[PDB]
């Protein structure tokens, strides 16, 4: 149209790799362990 642009992906320079995310496994499973500690006291004698 008159005076409007539209921005799009033109090209990719280089190799093509995977977009991702990284968490530490030790810290995350320690966090899940502590959440399980706090969560067993609301559902006693059960495995979550």
């Amino acid at each position, epitope marked *: 149209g008159p005076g409007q642009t539209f921005y799009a992906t033109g090209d990719i*320079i*280089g*190799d*093509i*790799k*995977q977009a*991702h995310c990284n968490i530490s496994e030790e810290k995350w499973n320690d966090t899940l362990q502590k959440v399980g500690i706090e969560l067993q006291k609301h559902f006693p004698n059960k495995t979550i």
Partner: antibody
Amino acid sequence: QVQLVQSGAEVKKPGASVKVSCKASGYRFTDHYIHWVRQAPGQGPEWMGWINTSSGRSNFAQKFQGRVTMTRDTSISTAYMELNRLKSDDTAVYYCTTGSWISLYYDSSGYPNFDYWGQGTLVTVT
Amino acid sequence: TQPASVSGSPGQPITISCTGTSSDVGNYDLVSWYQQHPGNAPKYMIYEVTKRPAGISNRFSGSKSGNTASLTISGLQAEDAADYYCCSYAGSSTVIFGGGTKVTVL
């Protein structure tokens, strides 16, 4: 010990095409990039391009576009170097080099870690 | 850019420099150094800005100052008369070289 085997001499008239074959041994073809180095006699080396051996995506230099194609075969673990419309300045030594480690999470294609070099080939244009 | 040749007596260090633009060496520390004997493939002893692979002693040492990268050869011997090339990453997944330097060991 890993090793790279390159093709023999290629003597032909200008205007034709040259295929250079590079065969790897001692390591799997999927894990590493393959780069190409062209060295004119009495002149320094010149980078030519890289190929992702895991998928076949390749890139060339800024002034070799339209003349150069990269192919490979992972079954027999080799790469092919096709150059079209050669000129008299294309008489040079061609080297197949092993680059960085191919990883799916970060672009290590442009790393100039040329670990192992092949024996090279000579291309003479009459 | 690279000096054409350097000369030196045995038993003393020498330096070979490579000065490039900010996009070549200033932005990215990917610089490498190879030597090439005549009638032979180029060798492999510097890959990162300072690192060395296995099988290479402390004869060679790389460094980067600002916009240039210099390789220092601590001591000299008659084996070190090969032609030295520096190489770097120029951006946009494009790799460039230096051009060459001939070492004349006395």
